[PDB]
Amino acid sequence: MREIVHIQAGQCGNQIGAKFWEVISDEHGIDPTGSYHGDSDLQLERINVYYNEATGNKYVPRAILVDLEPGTMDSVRSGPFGQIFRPDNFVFGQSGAGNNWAKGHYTEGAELVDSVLDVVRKESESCDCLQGFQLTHSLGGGTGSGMGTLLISKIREEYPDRIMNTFSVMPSPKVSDTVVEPYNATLSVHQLVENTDETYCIDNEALYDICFRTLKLTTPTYGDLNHLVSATMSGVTTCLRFPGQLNADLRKLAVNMVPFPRLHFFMPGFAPLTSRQYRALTVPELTQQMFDSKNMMAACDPRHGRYLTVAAIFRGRMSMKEVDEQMLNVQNKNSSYFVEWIPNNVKTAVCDIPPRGLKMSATFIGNSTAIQELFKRISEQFTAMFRRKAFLHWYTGEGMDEMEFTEAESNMNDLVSEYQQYQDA
């Protein structure tokens, strides 16, 4: 369990994916040219998890960039860390997907998917011990949604014994491009329920509310939203990128977080919430905030459900004793919100290296049954249109039948019911 193969698909996937590599490259002391200029050796002890090592001790991200149009991928190549990425790992078409899941999954993406798998295969063959894949994408578009889930199905066929992880961005009407986003999302969730081990549910609804209500950003941009995502992604991958005992690899994380195969949709949290402050935050303050609903990246009330499992990660120099005390304090004072039939379902890790700009930070990963509120929301938006078969001609024109929409709906409604089952157990 060493190498992870990163993939980023579509506009959203490549933009958040780009920021992700900008952030962790800084943490690991890698510069835009791929040279190491760090001070600590904690930075290079598990660098091979995400980076391949070339001659001159250059470090190249094990990342594959995918899109059905060259637009966003031209921007990435011109971006801050644009030149770090392996040129051959840029795989793109020309037609685009037009925010159509069917196009990314069945027609346009089918034409491009084989060339992506050729790059995935190249990377995988050089891995001493490939542990799995992590994908970044949105579910509301066409490429990242349609082709992303197609890649996942293909990767599982060729690598059935490796972990499949995803950072999936959920669509919200408050931050919407098109009206067919619920369709694309529902079709995608059906794929994710079956073919992933662990999905970090990142709700654009939540990212917007945080920027608006908390960070006091009157007019949030996608750039502002991504500041939060890149911070969350850096957090939840901390245990993977640095020396540690708890959840140090993708498989061990899945075993601790996933009591049932389908219930692997996680609610990420982060503290302190930052925007592009010098407040010295105490451990009790980190613990209170990371568990605060206003710090959750999925617009769900944790008090409306129960925690099946939780993974907390504190970063920075702090009292190990105090961290343990506070983590026990929240459990004991809110024991009703943690299921009693999974004893000690809250595991905690600590890393001496904090993220950029902060002295102390805390990342929260929770498998709550309250996540059903997210899927319920999409289901209502879905049904509102589907009952009148509105905007379906975009999909039937690509060869899809209405039956496939009906099935995808039923399976997501089942997922909701399964969460409700264990919320009352």
Binding site: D324, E325, L328, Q331, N332, K333, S335, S336, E340, P343
Partner: protein
């Protein structure tokens, strides 16, 4: 905010404790299977002491002493007294008792029974199990009823010369409530009760068990004078004391209570090293109910110890408050004591 759990729904005492705790607004009740608790109001049977004191960040307390059943079982109590050097066979305040199975002591029981057949002495004994009582001077009868049953019984010398309340010429027993906290401080509730008999005692017919058994249950049913002299055959200390002062020219403290405090302390200091939670990973407290008898010589006799006692109706409010004050709030502080601390350090 402290947390607790209830695992004994049939406990009147700790049902009131549960109520009082909630009223402080600083105690929250969890589900009875939630392990993250500070306090357990546990069950009577097979309380899982083995699962206590293994929750990080929680000082855990329970309302029972593991191993306290040694004192609260008929057969166990007899064995404890006769085999414990600090109690010994030379125990002046416990009636002559023998454990009988349907090891056994049937052999030795008859030995002393003969000296009373020979010695012309009152050879009456009572048999009981830990319903199911018989009183007779004939051992042949006693041993038969035990065999007719299917559990362990104990034969005990029946006090034929009990003290009798006048007017009435009637029997009684004293009930004292003792609280042992986590520090093993022995607290005697200053309010006891006399479960009196409402029928005149009669040492000619030991089968008419209504003037012989002072049980509030047997009295409220089988007796026809229930509630004549006192409300529900329950005389309290203020009255019983005045009676002793007027009739016998003595006080309750002197003539009886000295012996009671001696017996309570002697019984609990005996088993202390076997049940103490001084250096344990969890801690225990418990409410006990000692039952005593008083002969005509104003000598006190221990009958039994109850490990799960109920209280007198008008004494619940005061007693239950005292339990929270001394046994619970002592370990879990909130934001003229009703007890007498039993201690004595005689140097020799």
């Amino acid at each position: 905010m402290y947390t607790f759990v209830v695992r004994d729904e049939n406990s009147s005492v700790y049902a009131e404790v549960s109520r009082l705790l909630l009223a402080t607004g600083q105690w929250k009740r969890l589900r009875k299977d939630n392990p993250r608790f500070n306090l357990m109001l546990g069950e009577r049977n097979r309380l899982p002491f083995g699962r206590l004191g293994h929750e990080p960040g929680l000082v855990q307390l329970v309302n029972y002493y593991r191993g306290a059943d040694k004192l609260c079982r008929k057969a166990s109590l007899v064995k404890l007294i006769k085999t414990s050097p600090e109690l010994s066979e030379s125990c002046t305040w416990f009636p002559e008792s023998y454990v009988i199975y349907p090891t056994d002591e049937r052999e030795v029981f008859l030995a002393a029974y003969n000296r009373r057949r020979e010695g012309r002495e009152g050879n009456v004994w009572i048999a009981k199990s830990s319903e199911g009582i018989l009183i007779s001077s004939e051992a042949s009868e006693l041993l038969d009823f035990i065999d007719e049953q299917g559990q362990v019984h104990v034969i005990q010398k029946y006090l034929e010369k009990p003290l009798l309340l006048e007017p009435g010429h009637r029997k009684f027993d004293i009930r004292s409530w003792v609280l042992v906290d986590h520090l093993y401080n022995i607290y005697l509730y200053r309010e006891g009760v006399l479960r009196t008999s409402s029928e005149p005692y009669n040492s000619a017919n030991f089968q008419d068990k209504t003037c012989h058994l002072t049980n509030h249950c047997i009295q409220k049913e089988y007796s026809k004078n229930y509630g004549r002299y006192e409300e529900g055959n329950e005389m309290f200390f203020e009255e019983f004391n005045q009676y002793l002062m007027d009739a016998l020219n003595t006080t309750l403290e002197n003539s009886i209570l000295l012996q009671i405090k001696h017996i309570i302390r002697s019984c609990l200091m005996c088993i202390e090293p076997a049940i103490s939670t001084k250096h344990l990973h969890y801690q225990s407290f418990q409410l006990f109910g000692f039952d005593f008898m008083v002969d005509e010589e104003l000598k006190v006799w221990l009958i039994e110890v109850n490990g799960a006692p109920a209280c007198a109706q008008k004494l619940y409010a005061e007693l239950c408050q005292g339990i929270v004050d001394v046994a619970i709030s002592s370990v879990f502080p909130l934001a003229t004591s009703i007890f007498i601390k039993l201690h004595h350090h005689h140097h020799h």
